[PDB]
């Protein structure tokens, strides 16, 4: 789906398989967070359905023994001073030592400041010991999290369930036609993109000699020249687009290990899965009721959230006992108007716009030796379209490997561009999730004092009861980073900025910052930065010290009576699109044994009317709706046709007959040597076979 999902798939620990457990036999004690998982398994990233606790992810610093036991590093401390010697310990050796905590005040020399520290004793027992017994210490606050959980800013302010969903939903985002990096990040995004392997890096040092859209030539210092090719518009396993672009000039100097070309979800070497949008937290006329989202029309007129999806179709030409199938343009059954986009070989031409029911390749089957030719042509399935971007033909005579019994192979690739619309799923990094309820014109949107419309509106009723307050902090810090700030030090550094670095006392508009997962920006720092931000073109500060602004109403013109929270937030597009979920049917193909409608969307199938849905019908008292739903719409072979004729001619619907599944059941019971018969009011078993 994107590079993060591929990296996460390769770091998975699974408890099932040929030699382990079963989804049904597993109970409630194998799905728990043991105290010995600290530093070896992530307690947050896990599935949400029946596989909860049966699948997990390895931590960032973990490594495996020559026996199969996971280790984790620690810093040895002696005489109350932390050293810098790293020792790897297994879970069976770290329960005989007192291990301190990563977030512990450490002086310049390396002595604990607080008299007592929070440690971990033998049986995962947490205690408050005086700091003189410590024997080991953690290496970093992010030792206990995985690679996808370490990418959520302000993780310690979120509940476990919402952080779980945020980590799971970061692997379902789709690549967009243009990428841009977060305004607020964590710092893990640079080495999570190089290690994934979807970028191009230089294996040696040299200068760039030639750059185009599909190759880069680097001249090394010794004399050798190396050229790297690119994958332009390649189809991934899930139908998304994998496109690589160069980010170097024609005279740049390149060092070994530098990123040379971009990738699917990458912006200048760091992973970027979404976009920065201006938010308001307020209810709006009930269009964002119960987890819905309101968007602006500028996100459709400017291609902010647009993606390219590619599809693949095949067909096979083989021999027969009556002849040999041949691919050709000549078809004596259909007209010449629909055979205009085919070339002199029976295949479509590159650049043609196909639609539902259109023709892709033309193949005929002989019936024996003319007029023995039948029609079997590969056509676009129901509800598909797009241009044609590639054709790959394999033949037998040109020395190509082919399955025995077939003569020719051909593949056709069809691509489309999808914009954002109602029903599409959006998400954030903190657990926010909802479908788009409305798309509004840009003049119908609340706007700031200088006339800037907002881009997305989120409801305020969902934040307090779910305990994910990291999103509000993210919007505050994002506004401060977007506008830029400057701390005054005329009378010395303020009291709240004592612990800030010297490079964070001033910033430029559109700056990028980083807040690590368990050691980041405090709240005194945010509250103090919110009153230092720079003005805009005119000397006005739109957002006051609380992070709230006064907005106008775009439908009535009057100002809203109270200030509203405004900021910037990172929004990703999830791979659950409404164009792939709409379906309808009146009549179509039926089964063979039990003559009920087929199942599935690819086969033009029906919807199940299950057992639980019959109980509701029987509790309503509806005896005719159920009878019609069970006989003349599913199984009554003779009544289905008469019903169709009656509907077309405008007459009354006839009386239902008897379903076929009952007769199938009777013949099943008779085949087990059971003498089952249907009697009448006076004996004289009924034949129950029609025929008259």
């Amino acid at each position: 789906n994107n590079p993060l999902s591929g990296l996460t798939h390769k770091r998975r620990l699974s408890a099932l398989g040929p030699g382990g457990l079963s989804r049904e036999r597993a109970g409630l004690e194998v799905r728990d967070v043991h105290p010995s998982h600290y530093g070896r398994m992530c307690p947050i990233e896990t599935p949400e359905g029946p596989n909860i606790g049966l699948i997990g992810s390895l931590s960032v610093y973990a490594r495996v023994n020559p026996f199969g036991f996971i280790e984790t590093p620690y810093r040895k401390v002696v005489d109350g001073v932390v050293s810098d010697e790293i020792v790897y310990l297994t879970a069976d050796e770290e329960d005989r030592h007192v291990v301190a905590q990563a977030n512990s005040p450490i002086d310049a020399d390396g002595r604990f400041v607080e008299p007592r520290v929070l440690v971990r004793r033998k049986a995962g027992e947490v205690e408050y010991v005086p700091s003189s017994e410590v024997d080991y210490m953690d290496v970093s606050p992010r030792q206990m999290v995985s690679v996808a959980t370490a990418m959520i800013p302000f993780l310690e302010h979120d509940d476990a369930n919402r952080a779980l969903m945020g980590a799971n939903m970061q692997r379902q985002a789709v690549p967009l036609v243009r990428s841009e990096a977060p305004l607020v990040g964590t710092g893990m995004e640079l080495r999570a993109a190089i290690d994934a392997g979807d970028v191009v890096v230089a294996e040696e040092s040299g200068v760039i000699e030639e750059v185009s859209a599909d190759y880069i030539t680097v001249m090394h210092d010794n004399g050798t020249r190396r050229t790297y090719r690119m994958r332009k518009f390649a189809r991934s396993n899930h139908g998304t687009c994998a496109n690589q672009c160069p980010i170097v000039d024609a005279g740049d100097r390149v060092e070994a290990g530098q990123v040379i070309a971009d990738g699917p979800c990458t912006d200048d070497g760091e992973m970027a899965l979404g976009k920065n949008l201006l938010v308001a937290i307020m209810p709006w006329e009930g269009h964002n009721y119960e987890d819905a989202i309101i968007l602006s029309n500028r996100l459709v007129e400017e291609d902010v959230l647009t993606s390219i999806h590619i599809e693949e179709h095949e067909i096979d030409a083989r021999d027969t006992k009556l002849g040999a199938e041949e691919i050709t343009r000549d078809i004596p059954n259909i007209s010449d108007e629909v055979l205009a986009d085919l070339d002199e070989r029976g295949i479509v031409r590159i650049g043609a716009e196909v639609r539902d029911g259109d023709i892709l390749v033309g193949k005929v089957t002989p019936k024996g030796e003319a007029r023995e030719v039948r029609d079997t042509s590969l056509k676009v399935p129901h509800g598909e379209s797009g241009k044609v971007i590639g054709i790959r033909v394999f033949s037998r005579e040109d020395e190509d490997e082919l399955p025995a019994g077939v003569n020719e192979l051909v593949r056709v690739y069809v691509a489309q561009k999808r914009k954002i619309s109602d029903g599409d799923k959006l998400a954030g990094r903190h657990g926010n999730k909802g479908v788009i309820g409305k798309i509004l014109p840009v003049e119908d949107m609340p706007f700031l004092a200088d006339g800037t419309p907002v881009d997305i509106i989120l409801n305020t009723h969902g934040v307090p009861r779910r305990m994910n307050i990291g999103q509000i902090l993210e919007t505050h810090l994002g506004w401060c980073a977007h506008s830029g700030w400057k701390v005054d030090a005329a009378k010395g550094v303020p009291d709240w900025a004592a612990r800030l670095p010297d490079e964070l006392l001033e910033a430029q508009p559109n700056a990028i910052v980083s807040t690590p997962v368990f050691d980041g920006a405090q709240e005194a720092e945010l509250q103090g930065l919110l009153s230092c931000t720079l003005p805009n073109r005119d000397g006005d500060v739109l957002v006051d010290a609380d992070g709230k602004a006064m907005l106008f109403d775009g439908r009535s013109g009057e100002p809203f009576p109270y200030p509203v929270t405004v900021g910037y937030m990172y929004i990703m597009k999830l791979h659950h699109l409404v164009d792939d979920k709409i379906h309808a049917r009146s009549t179509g193909p039926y089964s063979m044994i039990t003559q009920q409608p087929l199942g599935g969307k690819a086969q033009f199938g029906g919807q199940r009317f299950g057992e639980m849905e019959c109980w509701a019908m029987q509790a309503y008292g509806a005896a005719y709706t159920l009878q019609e739903l069970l006989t003349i719409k599913s199984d009554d072979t003779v009544g289905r046709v008469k019903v169709y004729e009656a509907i077309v001619k405008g007459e009354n619907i006839p009386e239902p007959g008897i379903p076929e599944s009952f007769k199938v059941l009777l013949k099943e019971l008779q085949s087990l040597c059971l003498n089952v018969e249907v009697l009448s009011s006076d004996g004289a078993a009924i034949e129950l076979r029609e025929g008259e």
């Binding site: 290496v139 060092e255 070497g269």
Partner: peptide
Amino acid sequence: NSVPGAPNRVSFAKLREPLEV
């Protein structure tokens, strides 16, 4: 950091790290 060409992303961290992932 530790990568030849990378964007400058300033950090709020107050602790130092003795190990690299």
